[PDB]
Design a protein around this ligand. Structure first.
Ligand SMILES: *[C@](O)(C(=O)NC1CC1)[C@H](C[C@@H]1CCNC1=O)NC(=O)[C@H](CC(C)C)NC(=O)OCC(C)(C)Sc1ccccc1
Ligand SMILES: *[C@](O)(C(=O)NC1CC1)[C@H](C[C@@H]1CCNC1=O)NC(=O)[C@H](CC(C)C)NC(=O)OCC(C)(C)Sc1ccccc1
Lengths: 299, 300
């Protein structure tokens, strides 16, 4: 199994750069609006403790330089929504795809198009961790890069990049400007909380192993959801939700293995270890492939 | 941070089309007024067992080829064969044609794959050309004709077109001149790859990446000569390291202050002792599909 990103072209066609003064971030151009992190309006001195409302009231449309490549896109309106700035522009992006803005849950995966000065550099798959960070790859200049999924022809934007934490993980907002996790857009010391293992994705991985004929770990027993969740937390595994049980349904139907029976197998693995064996050629249990990712790569 | 990262695929997406001959549908690459695709699109299931492609192709007419770019059929007005690739001349140029070239990559080099089904892009990921000339891709039925590429400035360098999956689950294909990487043939007959080796220069690059991201338990105070390292490498079915490789690792050596031969001494220790149940950059195995250039680009 490979981490596989969505093809990035539909998002590449929406990337722009936004400059205030000497500060250039990436923005997302959809119809006649450009979305970007509001900290583009901050000086280094503002960043230490910014008053965004005051900073913005002193800004005018003509202070914002929006460019697609080197072609300026004139700004005709501006507003702030949580931690994102929305700049109305006088040109509708002819490459706008069908799109929506979604807020994802921990454990869900998405593709990141890393961009610098509006120019795409690379694309990779990420999982939202339970502590609301992503293990991304981002350098200075990447703020405003977005994460997304593509369903049929519709791009669901779910992430806009803002922050790199001391442990080298990343934090950001949805496209309505609300941070995932407790983070704030201020240049003050912050840290990722203790992370946990994404149980629903580990289960998806076990289902993937079964689909490929690797099934030594299946046992004759079952468990209740509550008993499993209480045990899982003692191994720093996330508890399951009803939604997790639901999204495992297709894999459960494909293999004939009830979700709670697979939970009982995973519990035995947690309690007893791998005893030197591998699953899908790995001694480690993978937790960044969702049930959707598994069906998309097996079938 | 450090991720396996593919090139943005947009420039290639705008070239993907669907090609159907008989009951076989796969992908084609539409550049200017030519569509490139695997020649086995012309085979029936019976032909595939032992195809005489020149004989099979002369019996085909332009109208036997259905090319579709989205909702639009493209009229085939000419066809020819170059090794294992079929070239369909069509009556309209692709306005989305990027600046491009066709290159043949060397083992150990990386490239991005745009996996496509029925002419539609489905996913993108990074692969390396293995020393045994396979690639460890993720390809299903319908993926034939998907391509691999690198991007340099605004120029797309196409290096791979997908043809086959071997019994071990690894993959095989051609350059865009239709010549296979490796000893493989486009016939439906069981085929095995030669023994593979690990791409040593890439393992070292990835160890340098691990240091840049603060993961350095595997370092040691020792050093080694290049030849003594290579003796151990070959014993463990790792490729030998050349002085060109040492030079290419230079910037990573400069960035970290770890001499290349010192990192070789660390890798020697890992080969001889294993990882003692530890991990590097989250992996329990030594990763060899990041080139030095891949690492520098990401960690600059
Ligand atoms: C983003 O602002 C950006 O790319 N701006 C472009 C250059 C003008 C950067 C992206 C970061 C920089 C390095 N890698 C990245 O992904 N974002 C920021 O610099 C953050 C801006 C805030 C949100 C207003 N600031 C930031 O991430 O600082 C981290 C701290 C201070 C919150 S936590 C920390 C403390 C000590 C050491 C490391 C991290
Ligand atoms: C390609 O032809 C394609 O996608 N065609 C579309 C569906 C009409 C496929 C791609 C393969 C299919 C499964 N995963 C893939 O990457 N290519 C082929 O089917 C090969 C066609 C040849 C080149 C004429 N055939 C093939 O890959 O078979 C493998 C063997 C027979 C060479 S080796 C083998 C033997 C036993 C078990 C597994 C593999």
């Amino acid at each position: 199994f490979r981490k596989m990103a969505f093809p990035s072209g539909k998002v590449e066609g929406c990337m722009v750069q936004v400059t205030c003064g000497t500060t250039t971030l990436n923005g997302l151009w959809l119809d006649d609006v450009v979305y970007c992190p509001r900290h583009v309006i901050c000086t280094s001195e503002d960043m230490l403790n910014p008053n965004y409302e005051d900073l913005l009231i002193r800004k005018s449309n003509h202070n914002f330089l929006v460019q697609a490549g080197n072609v300026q896109l004139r700004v005709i309106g501006h507003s702030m929504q949580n931690c994102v700035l929305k700049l109305k522009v006088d040109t509708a992006n002819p490459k706008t795809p069908k799109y929506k803005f979604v807020r994802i849950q921990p454990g869900q995966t998405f593709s990141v198009l890393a961009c610098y000065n509006g120019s795409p550099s690379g694309v990779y798959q990420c999982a939202m961790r339970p502590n609301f960070t992503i293990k991304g790859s981002f350098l200075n200049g990447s703020c405003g890069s977005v994460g997304f999924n593509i369903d049929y022809d519709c791009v669901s934007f779910c992430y806009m990049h803002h922050m790199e934490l001391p442990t080298g993980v990343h934090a950001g907002t949805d496209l309505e400007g609300n941070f995932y996790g407790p983070f704030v857009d201020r240049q003050t010391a912050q840290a990722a909380g203790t992370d946990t293992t994404i149980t629903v994705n580990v289960l998806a991985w076990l289902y993937a192993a079964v689909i490929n004929g690797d099934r030594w770990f299946l046992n004759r027993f079952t468990t209740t959801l509550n008993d499993f969740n209480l045990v899982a937390m003692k191994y720093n595994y996330e508890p399951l939700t009803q939604d997790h049980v639901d999204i495992l349904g297709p894999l459960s139907a494909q293999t004939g293995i009830a979700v709670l029976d697979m939970c009982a197998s995973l519990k035995e693995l947690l309690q007893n270890g791998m005893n030197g064996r591998t699953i899908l050629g790995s001694a480690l249990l993978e937790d960044e492939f969702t049930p959707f990712d598994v069906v998309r790569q097996c079938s």
